Each structure stands twice: as C-alpha cells, then as structure tokens.
Design a protein around this ligand. Structure first.
Ligand SMILES: *[C@@H]1O[C@H](CO)[C@@H](O[C@@H]2O[C@H](CO)[C@@H](O[C@@H]3O[C@H](CO)[C@@H](O)[C@H](O)[C@@H]3O)[C@H](O)[C@H]2NC(C)=O)[C@H](O)[C@H]1NC(C)=O
Ligand SMILES: O=C(OCc1cc(Cl)cc(Cl)c1)N1CCN(CC[C@@H](O)c2ccc3[nH]c(=O)oc3c2)CC1
Ligand SMILES: CC(C)CCC[C@@H](C)[C@H]1CC[C@H]2[C@@H]3[C@H](O)C=C4C[C@@H](O)CC[C@]4(C)[C@H]3CC[C@]12C
Ligand SMILES: [Ca+2]
Ligand code: NA
Ligand code: NA
Ligand SMILES: [Zn+2]
Ligand SMILES: [Zn+2]
Length: 772
C-alpha cells in the first residue's frame, strides 16, 4: 500500500510507476514522496553541502552522488564544473561508459510539433540543441508519416511501420470489428487491442534489453522526468534500462495557440532547450555524456491554421446528418447509422477555390500508404495546407487556435527534426532528409537489436552512424529472363491488329537489368531505342527502359501510323495482347511504354508500335500519359542533361502497396486475359552532377519517380478541361514516389549494377522528390 523506496519503479495493488496517475492507481503516498517539488530543480550556492532533507525535489548534499538524485546543476554550482553546453565539441570515437555497461544507452528525446525550421533560430534561443545538432549528426528535416498527427507518428517512430500497418491511423479512429472508437481523451487508448506491430520497448524486452517507460503522465513535470531518467541510469547493471524516452508536449501546445511563427514561440523553445541542458548536465555529472546516444526527434511540424479557413461539408452535401466526419486537417467520412459515389461526386471540383479534395482511399497518392486498414474510411479528404474541413458552420468555435498539423506529409510546414548525438552517431555530420519510418531500424542498430519486420529500408540510414552492425545485401533474382530471337512469322498472328508498314544495353539500361523478385516468365526484348522486360503472364512489360539525351528530338506519330500495332515476332501469339479486345472494350484504349514521340529515326519508330510495348489505357489517362511522353520526358532530359526512364504497370487492386498476384487482379480488358493496371510508374534517373550526361555519369545519381493512378476520368484534376500544360505536371507531382515504393508494387529491384555502394543506392531508393 505504499510507494516508500519505489518511486518510478520500472515494474489493483497500488502503483508508483510514472503512469499510475493516468490509470488512477497510485498509492496514497505517491504524490507526497514521488512528486516532491520543494526548492525546485536547481542547486544554488547556499545549498552546497546541505544536510539531506527528504522533502527536497533534488539534492545538493555530499551524499547525493552516492544516491543518484543530485540536481542536474550540482557539480556546476557546488564543484566548479562547466555546463555541458559551454564545453567545445570533442569527437566521441568510442563509447566511454562505466564497466558493466554492455551497450551504450539510448535516450530518445521527442518533441511534439517541433517544426524543422525552428532549428534556424540558433544558439541564442537553443544553445544546448544547437550544440547537439552541430557536434552530432543531423538532417535538415525529417519527414513524418500521414496523417501528420501525434499518435500515428510517435507509434511509427516506435515501430518502423506505416500507420496502416501499425493500426494507429489517427488521433481518432473507429474500428468496425471492435465497434468502438479510439480518442486522445478517454480510456479506450489504453486497451492493447488498438496497437499493432512491435514497438521498440517490446523489441528490446523480447531480446533481453530493458526499457524505461516511453510514456509520461502529463502530471509529471519535465524536470522530474529528466531526474527519473538520470536516476534509472544510476541503477545497478541487472536493473538498469538501456533505452529511455522523454516526451515534451511543447512546442506543439504553443504552436497550436499562437501558430508556428509567433514571437511567443521563443519561450517554449527556450524551455525545451533548458530541459535538454538539464539532461546533458545530468549526464555529464554521471560521466555518461560520452556514453549515451541521444536522439532529438519530433513527430511533425506545425502550420498556420485559423478557424476562419474552414470548408463545410454542409455546402456540398445535401444532408450532413447522414454522415460522420472525422474533421480538421484531414477528412474521413462514413455513414452515420448515404451513398459513397454520390458523396464523392458532390465533393468534387464544386468551388473554384475549393481547399480540399475527396478521394476514395485506394486513389490517394500511393506515397501516403494510407488505405490498407479497416480503420481508414473509404472516403477521404485531403485538406489544403492552412485549412480545415468541418461538417457545418456551427462546428467552428471562436479563433482558439492559430496552428495545426495533420496535412499531407510532403508539406514543408509538416517536416520535423532529427539530431543524433553520441558515440555511435557520426561527428559534425549532415545527412540528407529522410522519413521517420526509417528510425526504428536505426534505434535497433544502436541497441544491438534485431528489428521486427517494418517499412524502413534497413541500411538506407547507415550513413548516420560511425559504426554499423547491419550490412544490407542485394536480394537474389528469383526469375531469370529469356532472350527470345525471331521464331514466329507475321502470318501466324491472329491478334486482330493492323499497321500500315546489341549496344541497346549500353545506351538504354544504365543501371543494369531490374531483378524480378517473384516467380514468373518474362522476356528481355531489345530495340534501337529501348529495352523491356516483357511478362508472358501479364502480357505486357514489367518495365521498359530507355535513355533520352539532352539533344533528343521529339517527333509526331505520323497519320499513317495513328492506329498501328504490329505483332512481335519474338513472342508467341498466345502470350501477346490482341487488338480485338481493345476494339470490343468500349471504355479502354491503349498506349505505349516507350513513346513513339522519342524514336531516334522514322525506321526505329516502328518498334514503338510493337504489341509487346502496348499497355491498356483509359482515354482519360491517355491525356496524361501522352503529355508526359510527348512533352515532359523531353523537358526533363533538357533540364537534367539527359535522363534514363524506366516505366511500367502496377497492379494493386487490394491497395496494400504490394504487387498483386494474378488472383488479385479484378479487371481485365473485356473478353480477354489482359489485366488492367491500377497505376503506371516511371523512374527518371540522371547524374547528380548535371555537368555529366546521364549515360556517362561517374558519381551519385539523381532520381525522381511517380506512380500515376490509372483512372477512367480526370476528376482528380479540377483544371483538366484546360490544356495539359496547366494540370498534368501538377497531377504528377502529387503522385511523386520513392523508387522503393515502386519496388514494393512491382516485385522489381532497381539499380543493381552501378558504381555506387549498396547502402548509397538504398538511400537513393528511399529518396522522395517533394516539389516544395
Ligand atoms: C510494411 O511493413 C509490414 C511489416 O513487414 C508489411 O506488412 C506485412 O506484410 C506481409 C506480407 O503481406 C504480411 O505477411 C503475410 O501475412 C499473410 C496473412 O497473415 C500470410 O498469408 C503470408 O504468408 C505473409 O506472411 C504481414 O502480416 C504484414 N505485417 C504487418 C502488417 O505487421 C507491409 O506489407 C509493409 N508495407 C509496405 C507498403 O511495404
Ligand atoms: O510521453 C508520451 O510518449 C513519448 C513517446 C516517444 C516515442 Cl519516440 C515514441 C512513443 Cl510511442 C512515445 N506520451 C505520448 C502522448 N502524449 C499526449 C498526447 C495528447 O495529449 C496530444 C498531444 C499533442 C496533440 N496535438 C493534437 O492535435 O492533439 C494532441 C493530443 C503524452 C504521453
Ligand atoms: C497520458 C496518456 C496520453 C498516456 C497513454 C499511454 C498509453 C497509450 C500506453 C500505456 C501502455 C502502452 C502499451 C504497453 O507498452 C504494451 C504494449 C505492447 C505492444 O506490443 C503494443 C503496444 C502496447 C499495447 C502499448 C501501447 C501504448 C500504451 C497503451
Ligand atoms: Ca496488392
Ligand atoms: Na476501346
Ligand atoms: Na477534371
Ligand atoms: Zn504531435
Ligand atoms: Zn498538435
């Protein structure tokens, strides 16, 4: 019944752990013994050498070091030591830990709503943080997951999983299997049923590594959280955790009230830095300041949003009482106790300035990875940055907030911070921006743990670390290609088609053949202008590769070839598409993967009309694809000193972000076994050093990629009635993708033969071109 000698113990009989408040199960004496605040949190000169008083918050007695409960500034005030922040960076070449430490501890210092750009304020406001950032390893920014809300991001940090995989797809969710709702406020969130994957503290415990608590009752002051962490670190080897987390509700709280750019934001940032100072001072006191790896990380940024920039569903829908809306910086809509198609139509391009866009979740940009969970409603609203969506005018209250977050994770204002400091991180090193899904693997590496399966690309962040305990290995090809020669005659083909008619590898396949990582049968097909990997199962290329020089010439499809499709004599009639299917399918047309517009000669252009280069395309989609092919590829080649393009189909009918089996394809061209892609990708590569052409590049590569939804209309693009130069590129930028996203969706593995290290290539594959 007592907390005596058990305050913040690590293990209905009453509790003294840091969460007992939140379960209201603290012992009677918990507040009096575990939450002392007398004399506050700093030693002063007159307190030095005091007789211990057990009522003090922390201690300045001679014995306090033997007890591990000195105030964090005790050595500075009472033994003439300097503050950690006043010492120069000294490179930490190896961990300097007490004997009997078996690995360097990790302290995750997470800051709620810490926008990346707040680092620009410097050592005047945040001297401790600025030193961590200077002396350690930092990124200019770290990309959060969608939605850019607290719980989905913190749990992503902890698990390496997209929200659709870990299950915390929002701060609020409804689970139809449970018939219950999860919210920030309430007891429901404490139920383990909501939480999937395997968070870091569990991964650690399962592998015999002790974790401190990762959650702090809001009642526990920040200074006490630091002292508790420091006290735990002074535990004997058999009890001491190896991983700890601190969380700060700032600067989020202030960011919401004043917005991200308020002068009132300086004080919260000063307070966070002061807390960082206390930890680093505390660590220095314990001589652990060259032992512990410290991660300073946020969950997401903060945007200017005021209640005056709110769209109301009641101005679109004829009855908003039939719907339940999860509102704000995103929208999720389901039936109250109603028809989806009607709802989407009523929300689509109805006002010129319309500040959100409806999507069926499967049509959301694939880069969001926000579909494959029963908690994500079919109907989704992407809200423009700076705006909210709500059900009706009465739902806005007057404004109480000037900042918010939750928007699309490529939005600048949503980006957050990463700093790594300690023996295992590099010294004075800047690394490119990366996604928070990657951190779990790193944290596992830092702790000697095997990560549970997750969505990071293990190895992609090796360049953050002085020492790597993980070397990635390139996956093995599963299917070997065939290289068919000419073995069928024109007259053997009955495809209903009609037409009025080996340095390929050096030129067109710059980074090696893509490896097929699933069992299938496919053919390598060579031509003057392009190479392709043609699937006998799907009757089309898995990929088509070609290189367009800066100086390449765009030509038209001549009239006499407008409807030309030619049989490919290297491939059987039985493993080819047929033109009758397209003639019969009233809604479906076709396009070409290698564009006829970029043929090297009139003679070569005939290759582009081979049936093995043809893919099913809605006429609506052809507007987008034809523009990309006719105008944008030349534009990119001209800007980037040539480009290599790999394009192809994706099939993801079950919207899990993973390539479909034949079994999962739900749509075929009428009367045929020609599957309809859900998306078309392209990967566009050139030299990072643009003074070198794409085909003669000695160094780092530069990539941008997209996964375009293969839609029968352009309802997504409200300006699609206009010329393609007004909207298609905007469409493409929205559906920007990582190469890795394409790899998951195709079963292909790119960049197998380059002059770059595999870890560098993994970094390249995880890059997202954001266009901000
Ligand atoms: C993000 O990472 C997660 C975790 O690795 C991936 O989810 C995992 O996906 C696999 C493959 O679908 C699931 O394994 C499979 O489970 C089924 C059904 O139980 C079984 O029939 C198969 O034999 C196979 O083992 C696995 O459950 C699942 N893990 C989760 C949800 O935690 C996910 O695919 C990744 N997402 C992307 C877009 O790459
Ligand atoms: O200490 C914690 O975890 C630290 C941690 C670190 C790491 Cl790396 C991983 C993990 Cl898994 C957890 N806690 C997490 C939740 N937090 C209150 C949330 C709630 O008060 C809140 C906060 C901000 C909001 N913004 C908003 O719009 O609504 C909000 C609601 C306090 C307890
Ligand atoms: C003040 C409030 C915001 C605090 C709320 C914290 C709450 C969400 C935490 C408390 C306990 C946590 C669970 C616990 O660590 C065990 C597991 C096992 C793991 O495999 C899945 C996660 C889960 C259920 C934790 C989820 C987060 C919980 C409920
Ligand atoms: Ca799939
Ligand atoms: Na047709
Ligand atoms: Na349109
Ligand atoms: Zn947050
Ligand atoms: Zn917030």
């Amino acid at each position: 019944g007592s907390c005596k000698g058990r305050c913040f113990e690590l293990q209905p009989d009453c509790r003294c752990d840091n969460l007992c408040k939140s379960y209201s199960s603290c012992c009677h004496d918990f507040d009096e013994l575990c939450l002392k605040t007398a004399r506050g949190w700093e030693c002063t000169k007159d307190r030095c050498g005091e007789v211990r008083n057990e009522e003090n918050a922390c201690h300045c007695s001679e014995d306090c070091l033997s007890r591990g409960d000195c105030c964090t500034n005790y050595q500075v005030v009472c033994k003439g030591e300097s503050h950690w922040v006043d010492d120069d960076c000294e490179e930490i070449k190896v961990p300097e830990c007490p004997a009997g430490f078996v690995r360097p501890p990790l302290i995750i210092f997470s800051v709620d709503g810490f926008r990346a750009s707040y680092m620009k304020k410097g050592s005047k406001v945040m001297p401790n943080i600025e030193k961590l950032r200077s002396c350690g390893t930092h990124a200019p920014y770290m990309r959060p997951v969608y939605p850019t809300k607290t719980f989905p991001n913190l749990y992503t940090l902890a698990t390496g999983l997209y929200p659709e995989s870990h299950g915390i797809v929002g701060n609020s969710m409804y689970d139809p299997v449970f018939d219950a709702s999860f919210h920030l406020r309430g007891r429901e969130k404490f139920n383990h049923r909501w939480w999937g994957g395997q968070p870091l503290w569990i991964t650690a415990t399962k592998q015999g590594v002790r974790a401190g608590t990762f959650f702090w009752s809001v009642s526990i002051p920040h200074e006490r959280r630091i002292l508790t962490i420091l006290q735990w670190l002074s535990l004997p080897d058999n009890e001491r955790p190896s991983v700890y987390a601190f969380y700060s509700e700032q600067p989020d709280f202030s960011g919401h009230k004043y917005g991200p750019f308020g002068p009132e934001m300086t004080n919260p940032l000063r307070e966070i830095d002061k807390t960082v100072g206390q930890l680093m001072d505390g660590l220095k006191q314990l001589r652990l300041h060259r032992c512990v790896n410290v991660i300073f990380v946020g969950d997401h940024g903060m945007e200017d949003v005021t209640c005056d920039r709110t769209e109301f569903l009641s101005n679109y829908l004829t009855n908003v009482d039939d719907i339940t809306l999860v509102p704000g910086t995103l929208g999720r809509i389901r039936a109250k106790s109603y028809d989806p198609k009607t709802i989407i139509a009523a929300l689509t391009c109805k006002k010129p300035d319309q500040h959100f866009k409806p999507y069926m979740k499967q049509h959301l940009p694939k880069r969001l990875h926000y579909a494959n969970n029963r908690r994500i409603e079919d109907i989704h609203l992407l809200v423009d940055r700076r705006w909210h969506v709500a059900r009706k005018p009465l739902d806005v209250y007057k404004c109480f907030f000037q900042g918010d977050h939750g928007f699309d994770n490529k939005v600048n204002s949503m980006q957050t911070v990463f700093v790594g400091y300690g023996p295992t991180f590099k010294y004075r090193t800047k690394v490119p921006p990366f996604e928070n899904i990657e951190l779990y693997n790193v944290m596992c590496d830092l702790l000697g743990l095997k990560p549970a399966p997750n969505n990071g690309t293990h190895g992609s962040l090796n360049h953050l670390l002085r020492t790597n305990t993980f070397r990635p290995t390139m996956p093995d090809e599963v299917s070997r290609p065939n290289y068919p020669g000419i073995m069928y005659l024109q007259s053997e083909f009955d495809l209903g088609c009609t037409c009025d008619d080996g340095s390929t590898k050096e030129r067109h396949l710059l980074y090696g053949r893509p490896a097929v990582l699933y069992r299938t049968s496919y053919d390598i097909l060579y031509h003057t202008d392009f190479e392709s990997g043609y699937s006998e199962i799907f009757l089309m290329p898995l990929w088509t590769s070609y290189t367009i020089s800066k100086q390449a010439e765009v030509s038209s499809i001549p009239e006499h070839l407008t409807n030309c499709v030619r049989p490919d004599v290297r491939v059987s009639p039985g493993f080819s598409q047929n033109c009758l299917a397209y003639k019969n399918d009233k809604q479906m047309s076709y396009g070409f993967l290698f564009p006829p517009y970029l043929s090297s000669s009139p003679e070569a252009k005939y290759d582009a009309f081979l049936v093995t280069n043809m893919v099913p395309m809605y006429p609506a989609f052809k507007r987008v694809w034809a523009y990309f092919q006719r105008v944008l590829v030349k534009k990119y080649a001209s800007e980037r000193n040539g480009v290599n393009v790999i394009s192809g189909p994706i099939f993801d009918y079950n919207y899990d972000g993973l390539r479909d089996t034949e079994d999962e394809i739900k749509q075929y061209v009428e009367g045929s076994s020609i599957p309809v892609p859900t998306h078309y990708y392209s990967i566009i590569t050139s030299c990072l050093d643009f003074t070198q052409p794409a085909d003669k590049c000695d160094g780092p590569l530069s990539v941008s990629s997209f996964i375009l939804p293969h839609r029968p209309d352009n309802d997504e693009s409200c300006a699609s009635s206009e010329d393609e130069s007004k909207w298609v590129e905007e469409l493409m930028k929205m559906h920007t993708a990582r190469v890795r996203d394409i790899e998951h969706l195709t079963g292909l593995d790119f960049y197998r033969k380059t002059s770059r290290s595999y870890s560098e290539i993994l970094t390249l594959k995880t890059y997202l071109h954001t266009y901000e």
